[PDB]
Design a protein that fits this description.
The structure is cut from a larger assembly and holds one copy of chain A (about 500 residues) and two copies of chain B.
Chain A: H1 17-20, H2 34-40, H3 58-63, E1 72-73, E2 84-85, H4 162-167, E3 176-177, E4 188-191, E5 197-202, E6 204-205, H5 208-213, H6 237-240, E7 267-274, E8 278-279, H7 292-306, E9 319-324, E10 327-328, E11 337-338, E12 344-345, E13 354-355, E14 358-364, H8 375-378, E15 401-402, H9 430-440, E16 444-452, E17 468-478, E18 494-496, E19 505-507
Parallel strand pairs in A: 5-17
Antiparallel strand pairs in A: 1-6, 2-3, 4-5, 7-14, 7-15, 8-13, 9-14, 10-13, 11-12, 16-17, 18-19
Chain B: E1 19-22, E2 28-30, E3 34-39, E4 69-74, E5 83-92, H1 105-121, H2 127-135, E6 150-158, E7 165-167, H3 177-181, H4 186-197, E8 204-213, E9 238-241, E10 244-247, H5 252-258, E11 260-262, E12 272-273, H6 307-310, H7 322-333
Antiparallel strand pairs in B: 1-2, 1-5, 3-4, 5-8, 6-7, 6-8, 9-10, 11-12
Classes of the chains: A alpha+beta (about 500), B alpha+beta (about 350).
The structure holds a DNA duplex (7 and 33 nucleotides).
DNA sequence: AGACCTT
DNA sequence: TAGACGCGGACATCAAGCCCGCCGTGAAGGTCT
């Protein structure tokens, strides 16, 4: 809200150029109006003097950018990804689940190609006319609209170029256009009950990318910089703050307290799984421990391997015990592709974040009988969030089943860990979390569930052919538990509950 | 052919190679490193010459004799240690038999039949010795066995009933393919790899253990990061062992050491990283380019033709199962076989 | 001949740190330690009583130039009652100069390979390999600790080898010239194991050097220093639970590789480099305007092939020794 | 095929 | 086995903390015309 105070403090030219590009608080073009609309009609090449950009076939390149406005960014984080997605959150979320339903959606931006970045001015910038915070292209699509005789303040635009702006922009602002094949989109599949499965593709909202960037640019204990190498192809959001992408570092180096201070059934243990090089970029906005929907898929791909032998396993829950944690940048070398002109080189360069988790699991199934010794090793999966999953040879003698979960935490032969739950306090913005993250500096954030944009629908090339929606990411908060003598296990032993538009994983106490 | 989505996933997966220092009184501490700055000298070609001769006039005989600082990392064997030991683990499975993606039936039943008819006709005794000679040689250390006195591999199989099979001094004894075969545990560990590939849900696990004797204060070479941006060079990939920093020597760098078996390309001197364009990293060239006709997608498009050759008793095997040894190498490690996308 | 956009070699010589030890008349050995002490000196800089291109400034009066400068330095001396000093390191000699390491051009790779091969056959390794062994066997890797000392002695143990330890004694009087090492019982046997390391492929030789220094009472030791208040900070590692100065890993490689005395003035052996820089004075002999640097001899390598096919004259030999000495050092010869 | 392309 | 473990008073002044110079390069684009 710095309109004329920031217009002439006599600093420099590009103070305004940093102020319309949507990684900044807005301005409100109310008092001085014609001197600002002569800027956006002069931000196309890279006042009232460098004209002939007004009443020509300039509008043919100016109308094509309003179709590509991208509520969500389908090119995040891989460059070659065709798609147009512009739809709001489709529903609502409860009090302790941060997502982009909790912040208002007004930072959408052109992401198609390189040439039309500057020519995507004049209809994709947002300027807060008198009331509404609004853009410029979702306003000039009707006749009885003000600040349009100020288009006739410039004596160039004849009223037959008005006759195209009448009827060109008519019905645009609700579409979703992704085709699953041939495309570089990611997609997974998750159970919705014990009968079917729902496919879903996570995307990246560039309102949460804007919001976390322009609020974390002056605290360094809580921000980790992640760069990319072709900023123009990603769109103007990754060009304005070019490369940088401040995103929510873990908060402190990991601390290992003593584990526990103690003196139906079907509790199975898995001691000290070691993971080599799992990714840490869980959500598009957080860095740290991986998303706990990957701890869910590690369990559900394990219970399907045993059901190949006895088809009544029904794992029903799981419990996580983190002993070591280590995050750093390492770089993932992608290999040679056929580029497209005539050559064989590598694809585009990025930064990554990789992790190293030593953890152990408790599993509360219903199978009230012994499993085996041999095929309980052969049925283990070999990956956890793009990583490896190995144990030992000599730790195959600590794998046992039990029927009482208070002797089950005695079977872990390490005793230097930590347990995990969810923090049930309201987190309506980013400022709620960092206030709780500076009182503790021992709490982690990750993606705990998804959030649909769709009912869902049957799409042709969906992965395993099930049913395909499009989802967001649900930020949550992760806690430390000692399990002394009195903490009930309902704050442990998480599950998947399917709340009809969001698939959040939370423990079974709520 | 080549439908719009087809994918496998890998059948060999290693872990990282953590380093430890051993002391003469049989004690074990992890190996560490710390950063170090140094004074180099102006030696780049683009500081004196600009383009095609024409030396720069603003870079005279005193400007070139400056110094330029650059910061590096540095790791060495500490004084008064015995040797280095290098823990590591491998595994084997059978995921080359069934595809991970679908939606074309005529290539799904063809690519599972071709595995069945390669299995019984010309079995797994060719590939499973090449994958095991790379582990048991010391190819997975990449640079630490050069300028070294001796090294010794000791490997623990699973499921095994016997003593830990170990290979002694490799620079003198285990030279060629012969002396690996004249060991009293060799046919029991190749055949348990043959059991892993050829069984529906079979598994094999090897824990490998090296002992590395080096000279006094000799350096150690781990893997390096790939971050894109006093301009620090040589930042090491690391982990935390015992609350201490430790260089790890890769996780995908070890999968590239084991799968260096491809010597079936038109010149065929040195083995290559197994891939579809057959790229040599120390060159920029591509052996098996997509104009020679010997890249992977021009050998996968005779998959019904190699059905019609394996049935005949007259198998040529001079340059027609080298096209099938190469084809079955890319199914064990490959898994994104898709033409126009992804 | 023209050189590509990706070219690189690795080393062939690889030395390490020089750990120091104190030896007692009981015949036991401890590490050497140091301490930081602070000092008090004078106002004795010219930029402290004068003006820039001018006259003496009128703030530096007779009083204010007689105050004290306090400064903290490090300091390391031999303790009282010790006998001598013990030093140790090791050098490997590979052959990684035969073929390049990263080349991207099949035409210049054939030239660099057949130039090393024609070098081996006509002008052998008796001239280069003697020069690197010459510096290891008279303590040029100590740099200033043999200055103002009574006597130092060097004992080698090579690999692979069967026999006894090589030893050179009293290096101020006995081992001075080039003939003084030839007149030995053990000299020819160690030169053909450096040549066989270079000439053959997969060829290796490891030397492991140890020396003894005799200094006067409480004399001062001068190790390597760090790059960055504290003037004169020393380079440290941990030797059996203490802190000790190390005399550096790259610095002892820069004393093995002072063999260059073929430059157009030819007075003092220089450190081998691409442009031949000097640090006693801050100029460059072998500047590119002289036509004697690396990148002007590398681009004429096709010419040197048909000189080696009658013996070459003198300067074509002295530029082939300089070309081979930069490939042993080899250092990412990219351009454009 | 090549022209476009910003912090 | 039963007990107790002291009051009373000051912790000085003074000066200062130099300069020298540098901070390497090759490879990895999607899209409309």
């Amino acid at each position: 809200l710095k309109e004329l105070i920031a217009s002439n403090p006599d600093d420099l030219t590009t103070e305004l150029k940093r102020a319309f590009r949507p990684l900044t608080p807005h301005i409100a073009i109310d008092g001085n109006e014609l001197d600002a609309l002569t800027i956006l009609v002069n931000l196309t090449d890279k006042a009232k003097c460098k004209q002939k950009l007004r009443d020509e076939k300039w509008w043919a390149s100016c109308i094509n950018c309003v179709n590509y406005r991208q509520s969500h960014n389908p090119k995040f984080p891989d460059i070659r990804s065709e798609g147009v997605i512009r739809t709001q959150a489709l529903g609502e979320l409860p009090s302790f689940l941060l997502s982009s339903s909790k912040i208002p959606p007004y930072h959408w931006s052109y992401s198609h190609d390189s040439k039309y970045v500057n020519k995507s001015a004049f209809l994709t910038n947002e300027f807060c006319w008198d009331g509404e915070i609004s853009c410029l292209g979702e306003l000039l699509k009707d006749a009885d609209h003000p600040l349009w005789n100020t288009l006739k303040k410039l004596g160039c635009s004849q009223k037959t170029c008005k006759a195209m702006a009448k009827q060109l922009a008519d019905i645009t602002l609700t579409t979703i256009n992704v085709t699953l094949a041939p495309n570089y989109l990611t997609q997974i599949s998750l159970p919705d009950s014990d009968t079917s499965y729902i496919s879903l593709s996570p995307v990246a909202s560039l309102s949460m990318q804007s919001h976390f960037h322009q609020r974390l640019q002056d605290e360094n204990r809580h921000s980790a910089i992640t760069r990319f190498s072709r900023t123009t192809n990603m769109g103007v959001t990754a060009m304005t703050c070019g490369g940088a992408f401040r995103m929510l570092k873990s908060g402190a180096k990991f601390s290992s307290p003593p584990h526990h201070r103690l003196n139906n059934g079907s509790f199975l243990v898995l001691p000290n799984i070691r993971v080599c090089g799992a990714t840490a970029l869980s959500s598009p906005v957080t860095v740290g421990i991986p998303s706990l929907t990957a701890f869910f898929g590690f369990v559900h791909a394990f219970e399907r391997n045993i059901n190949r032998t006895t088809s009544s396993f029904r794992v029903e829950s799981f419990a996580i015990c983190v002993h070591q944690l280590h995050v750093e940048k390492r770089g993932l070398t992608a290999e040679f592709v056929e580029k497209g002109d005539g050559t064989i080189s590598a694809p585009a360069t990025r930064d990554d974040w990789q992790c190293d988790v030593v953890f152990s699991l408790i599993l509360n199934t219903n199978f009230a009988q012994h499993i085996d010794q041999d095929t309980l090793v052969t049925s283990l999966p070999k990956r956890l969030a793009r990583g490896s999953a190995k144990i030992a040879i000599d730790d195959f003698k600590h794998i046992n089943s039990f029927s009482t979960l208070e002797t089950a935490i005695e079977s872990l032969p390490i005793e230097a860990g930590r347990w995990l739950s969810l923090y049930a306090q309201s987190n309506n913005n980013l400022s709620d979390l960092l206030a709780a993250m500076t009182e503790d500096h021992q709490l982690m954030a990750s993606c705990v569930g998804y959030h649909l944009l769709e009912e869902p629908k049957d799409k042709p090339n969906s992965l395993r052919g099930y049913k395909h929606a499009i989802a967001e990411c649900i930020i949550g908060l992760i806690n430390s538990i000692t399990f002394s003598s009195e903490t009930d296990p309902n704050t442990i032993f998480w599950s998947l509950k399917n709340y009809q538009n969001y698939l959040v994983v939370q423990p079974r106490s709520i | 052919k080549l439908p719009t989505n087809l994918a496998y996933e890998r059948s060999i997966d290693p872990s990282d190679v953590c380093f430890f220092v051993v002391w003469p009184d049989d004690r074990k501490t992890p190996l560490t490193y710390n950063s170090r700055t140094l004074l180099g000298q102006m030696e780049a070609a683009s500081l004196a010459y600009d383009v095609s001769g024409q030396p720069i006039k603003s870079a005279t005989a005193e400007a070139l004799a400056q110094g330029n600082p650059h910061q590096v990392d540095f790791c060495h064997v500490p004084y008064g240690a015995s040797h280095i030991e290098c823990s590591f683990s491998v595994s084997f499975s059978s995921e080359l038999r069934q595809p991970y993606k679908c939606n074309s039936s005529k290539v799904k039943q063809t690519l599972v039949q071709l595995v069945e008819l390669y299995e019984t006709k010309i079995g797994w005794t060719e590939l499973a010795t090449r994958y095991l000679m790379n582990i048991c040689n010391g190819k997975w250390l990449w640079k630490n066995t050069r300028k070294a006195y001796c090294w010794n591999i000791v490997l623990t199989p699973w499921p095994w009933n016997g003593e830990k099979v170990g290979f002694e001094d490799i620079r003198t004894n285990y030279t060629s393919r012969q002396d690996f075969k004249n060991n009293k545990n060799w046919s029991a560990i190749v055949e348990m790899i043959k059991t892993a590939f050829s069984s529906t849900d079979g598994l094999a696990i090897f824990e490998v253990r090296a002992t590395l004797h080096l000279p006094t204060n000799a350096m150690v070479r781990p893997s390096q990061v790939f971050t894109e941006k006093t301009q620090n060079s040589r930042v090491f990939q690391s982990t935390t062992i015992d609350g201490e920093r430790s260089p790890i020597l890769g996780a995908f760098k070890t999968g590239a050491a084991i799968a260096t078996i491809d010597d079936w390309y038109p010149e065929a001197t040195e083995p290559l990283r197994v891939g579809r364009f057959g790229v040599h990293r120390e060159d920029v060239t591509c052996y098996r380019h997509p104009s020679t006709g010997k890249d992977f997608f021009s050998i996968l498009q005779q998959a019904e033709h190699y059905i019609e050759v394996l049935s005949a008793n007259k198998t040529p095997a001079q340059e027609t199962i080298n096209d099938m040894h190469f084809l079955m190498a890319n199914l064990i490690k490959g898994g994104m076989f898709q033409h126009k996308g992804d």
